[PDB]
Amino acid sequence: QEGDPEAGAKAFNQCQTCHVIVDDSGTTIAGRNAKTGPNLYGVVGRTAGTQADFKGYGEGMKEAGAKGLAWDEEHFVQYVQDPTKFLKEYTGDAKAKGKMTFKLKKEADAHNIWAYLQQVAVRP
């Protein structure tokens, strides 16, 4: 919401190596065909670790979603900044790591990509 969606659309290039945003009709809104990560379409407000077509979720992600994690900005930003650190605290498991552990470099990108998802990845 307070980030720059247009700056986020551009910062999304960092994520398209592994994600894609493809609406229910099947149109690619961002990215080409990366499957490593889950389709980010409809992630806003979605319960962590529940994208129907994804099969590579780590246990930490499936459990955080089971403990009640649905994506909002606050969380989404903490997560991409340090994904392990976030899964350990949310999950309470000091042994959770996740399938992606790189830490985002800028916090602004995080807010901007969120403002962009809020503009293109919200499942009506």
Residue 75 is assigned to a ligand binding site = no
Report the nearest approach of ligand HEC to the CB of residue 26 (Å): 18
Residue 17 touches ligand HEC, criterion: CB under 6 A: yes
Given candidates 4, 7, 14, 85, which one binds ligand HEC under the rule CB under 6 A? Answer: 14
Q: What span, in angstroms and rounded, lies between the C-alpha atoms of 21 and 5?
A: 15
2-10, 22-30, 32-40 -> range binding ligand HEC (CB under 6 A)? 32-40
Interface pick for ligand HEC out of 21, 113, 115, 121 (rule CB under 6 A): 113
The number of CA neighbours under 13 Å toward the Cβ of 28 is 9
72 contact partners, CB below 8 Å, separation of at least 6: 44, 45
> Please, which of residues 36-95 interact with ligand HEC by CB under 6 A?
36-38, 43, 48-49, 51, 56-58, 60-61, 71, 76, 80
In DSSP terms, which residues pair with 28 in a beta bridge?
Answer: 22
Q: How would you class 58 by CB atoms within 10 Å of its CB: exposed for 0-12, middle for 13-18, buried for 19 or more?
A: middle
